[model samples]
Every structure is written in C-alpha cells, then in structure tokens.
Target chain A: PSKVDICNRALSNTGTDITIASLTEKSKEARLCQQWYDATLASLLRTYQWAFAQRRVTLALIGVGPAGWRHKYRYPTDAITIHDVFTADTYPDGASEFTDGRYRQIFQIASDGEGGRLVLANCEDAMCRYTSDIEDPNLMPPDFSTALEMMLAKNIAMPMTGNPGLMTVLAQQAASLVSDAIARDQNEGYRNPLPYASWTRANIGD
Target chain B: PSKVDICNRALSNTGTDITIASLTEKSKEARLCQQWYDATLASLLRTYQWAFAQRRVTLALIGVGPAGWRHKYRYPTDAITIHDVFTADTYPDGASEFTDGRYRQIFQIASDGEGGRLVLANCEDAMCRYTSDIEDPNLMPPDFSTALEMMLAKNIAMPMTGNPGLMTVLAQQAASLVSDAIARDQNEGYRNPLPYASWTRANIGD
Candidate 1:
C-alpha cells in the first residue's frame, strides 16, 4: 500500500501485531501510536512490577519528607526512579546509564516483607525505568527538537522576504509552542513513559 | 509480617502467589526475567501497524532454492551457507564491541502472493543475537565481551559469575536457529526482525 493508504489504515487501526515497515509507513498518529505502545509496554511492566513488589517505596517521596510532609516530593517523583548510584556518583554517559541503586533495592526488598511498602519503591523502580527493555545501553542520536525548528523557521522567512520579521514572530511562537508541548509532555507522564529519575540519575549533582 | 517471617513463609510454602522472599535472594534472575520479557514484548508490539494489519501465518517447507529453505529434514546438500561479509565495523567508545564484519547470510523468499516481490533479507543473526536493543550510533564501543567476562569472573564473581557469559553465546546460536523458530515466535512473512542493512544487502556471494 502507499504511504497514504498505510496512514489511513493506521488511523482505523491501533498499533499492534505488525511489521516495522507497515507500522512506520502508517499515518503520523499511527506511528506515534506504535511508539506509544512500545514505550508503554516497556515502562508499564516495570511500573507494575515495582508497584506489586512495593520495594524501593522509599523512592516514591524523595524531595518530600516522609509522612506526607513538605520537601518529600522534591526532585524525582514518578512511577519509577532510577539512579546510577554507581561508583562515580555521577552519570556521564547518555546511556551507559546504570543503576547500582536498583541492585541495592532488590537486595533490600528481598528481605523486607512489607508488601504495601508505601507504594513507591524508590531507586529500584527508577533504575528499572532507566534500563527498561526499550533502553539500549548503546548511545543514540541526541534529541534536536529546538535546533530543527530554529533551522526550519530561519530557512522559510529570511530578512530578504517581503514578510521580513512577520514570519520571525510566527516562527518564534511556533518554537515556544513546541518547547512548551515538550515540557508539558514531560510532566504528563504517559507521553514521556521514561521517568525523570533517568535524567536526574547518579550523575546529576556532580 | 516481619522480614524473618516472610523469609520463613517462603521456605515453608512453595505455591503461595505472594508468599514471601526465600532465604536466598535470586534477584539477578528477576532482572533477567524482566529483560527477556521486555525484549519479547517490544518485539511483538513494536512492529508497524500495517505489517500487523496483514494476517500473520506460519508455513512448512519441503525444499530449497530461490524460495529459500528451512527444514524439518536435513538438506541432501549443505543446508546452510555463509558469505564472508565484514565491514571492519569496529566499536570504539563504550557503546559496542565488534570491529570486524560480523557474519551474515543472504536469502530470497517469496511472499506466496501472486506477483509478489522476491525479497532479500540479511541473516546477521549472530550480530543480532549478541546485541541488546540499539547500539550507540556514535563512538561505538569496542567489543568488551572479553574484558567484561574477565571482570565478571574477578570482581563481580559474587553477583555475576556464571550468568554474564551465556547471553552472547546464546545469541550467536540463535542466529543459526532462526528458521522455524523465527516464524514460530514472530509469525509468518515476517521480514527479518534484525533491523540494519549492509551495503552488501542485495548481493550474497558464498
């Protein structure tokens, strides 16, 4: 089928049980749908497993203090939180990302019988989120959302055009919109199945 | 229940769903189980929607030729063959480990549909087997399996003595085991699941 056909078919169909080319060829939404499914399956299992285990519940309320006090929910608060918690205490690699922290929690949770362990099993969940199945230890291309938009707008409406600065304003607005969408998506959780701890992992403060 | 009680319960009862932790903490296996599950789930669900839109089927074969061959019976002649295909592909950074041409195969299989195209697929199962997810596109890591094994043997003996070496070996074996197994696991007409193509994709010289 043509790309259009694939896209149309994709609209009618949810992503699943298919080939890569077919899925990728499907409509934009379908492609995103497939990505969403992939990310979701990868993340939700870890989330569910951690939730069920109730280990690392300590992680659920990090920045915030215990007992539902202020400061407990500070830095990383998500379904999962993974810290490199490795020897360096700093994570330099985009992905050589590791979490000795998860290992530590696994050991602790083994001994702790508290199934309802606060429902937020901390570092272990975070680590699982970071190294989840979808995560490849291999490095990947850097995300270039901002740069791409800047180039797109810069190319379209230069000072030489009759519209001069008009396009610039529109482009600027578009850029902000895109950035905000990204930020919003980050917080919305489902869109960004990866937890925040992946970013704030062992390498942050250093 | 306390940790000790949980431990005791686990030892006392073998069939309880959430009985408790055993005295021995087999946490590593838990991570491996998660990894296997994650990889398999991603493989099944991440295919393009259109690919899945077409029906998935399994087939049995009796012979070989331009149709390609997998067998329940051994080939009267050499059933499988390889072509010397290497790209001096090296892993330099911490992302991947191989620098030479990983072994690969070339085969043609018809879709069984009328006027179907004779598709050519790369059989780099060896390369695919050892790899986890995607490799770092940049600064590929030099193959560290040897060094990694040595380290595991030494420092991590307690945590990873026997387990670390198995995956790489198993992957290579699976590359050859890809006949009915691929179709059985991935369904029929599945274009080879291994994603990358070589400059040598079209031509296969034995």
Candidate 2:
C-alpha cells in the first residue's frame, strides 16, 4: 500500500469524520496519520523480515591518495550495517583487481567521531555487502502491509477518539490477525523471519 | 530516468563491450555501474537543487503515559531535521480546537542516552514540521533527468573505456549544462535552489 493508503486506513479505523484531504492538511490529524503510519511501519520491520526491506550492496572501496593505514572512505549513506566484506587482490604496481577476491576480507566499521567510516588493513579495493533501512511501504509484502495497517489503527485509536475502550476489541483482533499472518509465513518454510537481534554470534557462528 | 535507464547510460558511457545484463551481474563492471550511479547522484544532489528531492513532513507527537515532566516521542524516521514545531494548546480538557494554537509552547529535542527523543513540558499533542532525505531520482524533473544521464556518463568514462580523459571534456560540458539548468530554475524564481548545508544560521536566522 502507498503512504496515502496507509494514512487513510489509520484515519478510517479511528472513526474520525475527517476526509483524506483534511487528514493530509497541516493539522493534528494529518500529522498523526503520517507519524502513526511511519512508527507502525518501522515497528513491523523490526518485528518481521520483509524481503523488500532487505538490500544487499557490494561497495567498491576507493583508496585515499597514497598507500597507508590512514586511508578512509565514506560508507553508503543508506547502509544501516555491514554484513560482509571481500578484499580485492592488488598487484605490486598498486593496480587492484575489482572482481576477484583472494580471500574473504575482515574490516572494521570505524567512526570519524560522528558518522560511520570504513577501515581496511592493507587492501585498496574492498566490497562491502550490507543492508539498508529503506522504509518504503509501497514495496512491503501484502501480508506485512495488512499487519501494518492494523497496528497503526491500534496506535491511533485513543488519540482519534476519547473512548480508549472503543477499539480495544478491534486492536486485539488486529493483533491476532497479525500473528496469524506471521505464522502463515513461517509455516511456508520462511526461515529467519525474525529480527537481526534474534541471531546471535553463537547461532550464526560469525 | 529510471534506475535501469541510468544503469544503461552508465554502461554505454563506459563502452565496456558488456551489455546491461552484465552490469547487473556480480561482475566488477556491474558493481562499478551501481557505485558510480550512486556517487554521481549524490554529488549532483549536493551541487545543485532538485525540487523533487525535497519532502516536507509534519509529524504528530504521542505523549508518554502519565505525562508530568518526562515525556518523550520518537522522531520521524524519514525526517532529516525538524523545521518547525507546533505546541498543543491545552484547555479545560474538553476544547476541540485542532486548528488554532492558543500558545506557542516550548520543547526540546532530548537524547535519551541512546536515541533522539522529543520532550515537551505540558502539551499532549504537538506537530513537528520537518524535511527529509528522500532521494528518488525517478521523481526528478525532466531537465534534471537529462543532466543526470550526462553526469553519470561522464563519471564512468575511464572504466567503460581505456582513456581516463575520454569523457573529461564531456564531463565539463555536462557540468556547465547542469549549472545552466540551475540558473534557469533560479531565474524562474526557484527559491532554495541549493543544498541544505548551504543555508546557514545567518541566512535563516532564528
């Protein structure tokens, strides 16, 4: 679903007599629609593994002037964390191979005091396989989108109307629906549907 | 231009006998094409203003439970920075004024020893006006799209072909063309035709 669609769903579930255009205005309802939509989406992404949210990027390391340990390169702006690294093989003449890696590379994600930076020991060319925090709801899976809508409705229930108990049963139903959706995905042999935190060093053997 | 179109342009400019399919492979050429596209796009965004990249979002504030002096809420994930804040006007608990703010309330962006959180003193509802780092090149203006193709072509001139200087003149010409496009936008009263960093505190005094 698009952002507008999610917003409309949230607004409608809240039982507010506001129209779509009114919800999109610079009013409290409009702001709540957007805020709740994003918050719910983020929460859902952390709770489940949506294939569209996963991006694998292999970044080519650019050398810093002369050959030295002090070389630095900026990380991809959208990258949330580094998944793996493959260092490039270099010739004596400083020409580095960009395609083949002699071995899997080990590197550290160093910070230049504020933002994340890359640090390699010796190799000039390195590939960083990483994931991103791309939060485009339009790319979400259909089941996940449905869950998001339900969760958002649950969140905005009290704010849209004074009766906190009005949407209690609805929220419970929505939660149950979300659980069923997750179970359905799992039963279909969806391994590793959990968050990254669920995978420890002991589990993945990193 | 779409991502595929940009990739094709990069491949064509590089003159690597490899086709578009090759560039999307695990091959070095494919990696470089993607890298160059991102780099060129980033450089272009910093150099000139593209109106399509600017996104304005007004987020609604959710109050912490039993709100006394300690209230916190998450910032919008997509928001780069808060442009403005509208504090909620509290009346005798039954006021239905969502349009007007009775008082300009004060709030601070606090760090909860982990992440950025919004802290308000008394208000339950707040609106945060913010801008985003939404970089969707497909939504770019027609002139900007043409300029991006030219810029990407110039960036991969060396790897696509053998001559590092192959597209130097073309790159300079593209740069000039981009400058002219920005000039046209400015001449047509395109305000804020520069990067966000360029707008300093002095320019937009508090």
Candidate 2, residue A68: lDDT: 20
What does TM-score give for chain A of every model? 0.22, 0.57
CA lDDT of each candidate?
Answer: 0.27, 0.52
lDDT of 2: 0.52
The candidates' DockQ values read: 0.01, 0.01
Sort candidate 1 into its docking category: incorrect
The lDDT leader among the candidates is: 2
Q: Which ten residues in a row have the lowest lDDT in candidate 1 chain B?
A: B137-146
TM-score, per-candidate, Cα-based = 0.19, 0.35
Q: How close is chain B to the truth by TM-score, in each candidate?
A: 0.21, 0.53
TM-score of candidate 1 relative to the true fold? 0.19
